[PDB]
Ligand SMILES: O=C(Nc1nc(-c2ccncc2)cs1)c1ccccc1F
């Protein structure tokens with residue numbers, strides 16, 4: 001490569017939104033550095049003290065100029081988790097309305113889990129799919145990570161199911177939209193591993209978008225993923241993701257198809273197929289699914305609906321989807337006279353949200369520990385350098 | 393406004409004088425990786441995961457950015473406690489420069505001024521800085537090569553007739569005025585700092601002792617700075633109570649430079665180093681000229697005009713009184729057009745890499761905890777954000 005080439009490859013790396021060394025990523029590195037060094041114990045070191053003094057006024061200017069949490073007026077808290085909360089926000093200046101997901105830095109290190117958010121960030125920021133909730137901005141500070149997404153006023157499928165005894169025609173639509181959405185994620189080289197109605201959001205038109213990609217992972221050369229992670233609510237998780245708690249096994253995308261079948265069973269039956277009072281009881285039923293899977297006597301569920309569920313609720317080796325989406329798509333359950341796969345999101349959804357305003361939260365039910373002072377360099381902000389992201 | 397905030401923030405990453413431009417930011421991340429990558433520190437998971445996450449990335453950057461291996465070293469032209477200076481050929485561009493290496497370790501045991509002056513003087517009187525870069529061990533300053541060598545070399549191989557001394561003194565006066573105009577006092581003007589270009593014209597290099605003057609063009613410095621034979625009496629006495637001095641201290645050195653060119657020795661030479669300091673202090677009585685019918689009336693006057701106490705020293709009331717001096721009265725050059733004239737010694741060079749005018753020629757321990765040795769050097773890079 002020529003000197004000019006070398007200069008421009010480097011220049012374009014500072015401008016790339018997908019670059020690990022983008023001006024915002026680099027700015028994080030400096031912001032972290034200042035945060036993790038500014039303590040009386042550490043300032044004893046002159047290299048450290050002079051650096052902080054040199055970058056004092058500068059770092060403050062930057063901190064104020066860059067996107068901060070105070071740029072958003074919080075309209076309502078729409079969701080809440082261990083990590084932190086999800087909230088309907090209005091950007092004070094642009095007066096634009098978004099949904100913002102806050103993740104506690106202390107609560108992530110405390111819990112040891114610090115890497116999921118990278119996948120959630122990447123997926124939402126770069127999917128460029130009608131099936132994925134869009135990330136417009138990602139920013140941070142010493143306490144939280146912030147993800148500014150598009151607001152999905154239709155609420156989640158949990159809310160839909162809780163208000164309706166779903167007819168088969170609706171379930172067919174929602175399952176189809178999910179299959180399409182998951183295929184989109186799979187095409188990006190990702191497996192979700194915990195697909196549930198909580199992750200299924202509805203836009204202003206009643207169409208599906210997947211959100212909350214916290215359990216997402218990039219597939220290896222073989223479209224597989226290993227995992228030494230613990231399970232949180234097994235109800236929708238595949239037997240293989242449970243079978244591999246400790247990294248004792250790789251699994252492919254067919255694990256998400258299992259969750260699809262569960263989603264269908266729940267929409268038509270009214271309960272999940274492996275529910276048990278205790279959490280461990282659910283895990284047992286999932287494991288024993290060959291015998292634990294039963295359908296109620298009311299011949300309400302059609303032949304093809306019962307078949308698709310069982311096609312998905314089997315061991316991976318014989319599970320529908322093992323040979324790609326097309327065998328799922330070809331299933332007779334999806335045989336209809338309302339929509340075509342290639343034009344489904346352009347059709348009229350079964351439940352169209354009637355909204356009062358850009359800030360209507362009717363489809364959402366109504367609903368702080370700090371790091372200690374370091375006695376030596378601990379670098380609490382380092383696992384988050386490069387999380388900042390802006391759109392142009 | 394949102395768009396103002398975005399703009400202010402964007403203009404800061406582009407500014408060559410900004411503390412947070414691409415150069416500085418890339419320097420920080422590079423410093424962070426360097427100061428953390430040790431087995432003792434990698435015991436910390438926050439630290440180890442960060443390094444692992446940025447491994448391939450940091451290497452790509454390190455390879456893409458200007459590195460020392462991009463230059464083929466042609467010859468070591470100067471050497472110093474600080475480091476070495478070397479004639480280099482940039483392997484790709486095949487372009488020839490002089491590169492000044494400064495040992496980071498040897499410093500922790502001034503370069504910001506040297507960098508700024510050379511990178512932004514935009515003066516024919518100052519050696520040009522094209523690039524500045526670094527690594528874990530050294531700072532690198534890629535400057536234009538001055539093949540005419542230093543005035544020390546000229547003086548050592550010639551007996552300088554008055555007509556030549558007049559030229560070189562004049563070029564120095566102009567060069568120092570340029571530095572002064574930038575708000576700096578050289579504080580160590582010597583023939584070692586005076587380099588000659590391909591045409592035989594002067595350029596000042598090595599601004600190691602340069603200090604920015606205050607509001608009233610003064611400098612409060614509690615410690616002596618410079619070389620023993622050139623140090624002014626005021627910068628020699630420079631202490632707690634005193635400390636305060638102006639640009640007239642460089643004019644003292646100009647007189648020393650003239651005396652040496654014409655006489656052949658410095659005016660306060662003594663066998664011992666301490667003996668020189670004594671003579672400097674007693675400049676009123678120690679300044680003598682040999683029985684030399686060749687040192688003119690006006691040359692002797694200019695020397696004494698400069699080799700006096702600051703209060704009555706030529707230059708106290710600006711350059712124009714130095715310029716107006718009869719010593720500079722001539723029919724060869726005008727001050728305005730002087731660097732456009734033909735120099736008294738025009739270098740006869742064999743190639744772009746001729747080094748004939750140049751005489752022939754450990755780091756930090758491994759940290760047991762975070763010490764941040766690369767932090768005092770974040771921003772030194774002059775590559776991604778330069779003035780054009
Ligand atoms: O992560 C979560 N929810 C999410 N909701 C949105 C969203 C909401 C509305 N409009 C666009 C996007 C994105 S992620 C979550 C997880 C566990 C517990 C509570 C939670 F709220």
Ligand SMILES: O=C(Nc1nc(-c2ccncc2)cs1)c1ccccc1F
Nearest residue numbers: 470471472477490535536537538597598
């Ligand atoms: O700093 C020093 N020399 C310098 N030489 C140049 C230069 C040389 C050639 N062409 C352009 C520029 C720049 S600075 C020095 C000081 C003390 C001891 C040895 C040294 F080499």
